[PDB]
Design a protein around this ligand. Sequence first.
Ligand SMILES: [Zn+2]
Ligand SMILES: [Zn+2]
Lengths: 192, 192
Amino acid sequence: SERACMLCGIVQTTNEFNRDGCPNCQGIFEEAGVSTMECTSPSFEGLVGMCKPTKSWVAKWLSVDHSIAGMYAIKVDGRLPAEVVELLPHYKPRDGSGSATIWGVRCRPGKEKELIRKLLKKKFNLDRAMGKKKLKILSIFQRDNYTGRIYIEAPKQSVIEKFCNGVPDIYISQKLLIPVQELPLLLKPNLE
Amino acid sequence: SERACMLCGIVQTTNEFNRDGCPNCQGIFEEAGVSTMECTSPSFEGLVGMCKPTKSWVAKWLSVDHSIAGMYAIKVDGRLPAEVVELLPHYKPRDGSGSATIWGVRCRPGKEKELIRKLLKKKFNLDRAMGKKKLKILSIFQRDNYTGRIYIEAPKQSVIEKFCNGVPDIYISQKLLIPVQELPLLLKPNLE
Ligand SMILES: [Zn+2]
Ligand SMILES: [Zn+2]
């Protein structure tokens, strides 16, 4: 009789979703023209008693930090209806899919920061020049401790190659999709 | 001449902060009665060319996903003025401090989900009964694959012991502060 909301992750009984809808997402569901029930799933895992959403790091990582105190699920199986998804650019699936795709690209040691500056400017100029469809470069970054590499967030290898073509000091043919298990060590504020 | 905003992480020249303030945080700084300059730091690391904040996982993890496209820093040294901090419950320091404190607590195998339900209810009842100062229990959670343990987010060991006292099936004297490097494997939607 328990179900979890695919948008916010909240766990309530079927009766509660039927009576009250979702305490977090109801406005969005109303605008989407969808029922709360079809936005919920009977299949979920990882119960979270969320007591202080504004302070909790768990809440931050699960995107429940702007949601109400209550019971949440870490993993919710199922696909949110398209009419909800099209309203929410920030939506990221709670089933594990739609994941981080970050590519480590080899570059000339000592040029890492310079390259981030140059490529950010390049993307800005491409957006100004191109039409409706932009190059899907989401972000680019470097870490001082990881010399000779820059990191490019983009869904496909082809996009990065298209983006880096003709740019000096980028060794575009030497790249690696960073495994998820390596990502935390990559973006933690204090390294080593 | 470059500085990074301690609140949003944005990197701009001193001149740019002087002219335009912070494009993200100026409203908050105005309400706080503080200058933009004293909310910025000359000491920062990890340049991020942020191109698509609403879509980027990097942006999500750095809390720049609701900020403007631009250059950001992963680590910003320095202390945000108190009059800014007191306005923002969601504020988490960009220097590495104010970190996730999650305790793995041993429990009777098979009672994990039950305990999350019971403890969430306990905290709710304590908030209703207690005065201004509440028990600093931020969240509690379990993972199906990690049997015989529950996880409690709280700043101090004493708080957890106070919270779990007299609760059956919790083995409160057997606990461990989870190292940061183990946290990603703990909260990832799909385990093993
Ligand atoms: Zn919801
Ligand atoms: Zn700012």
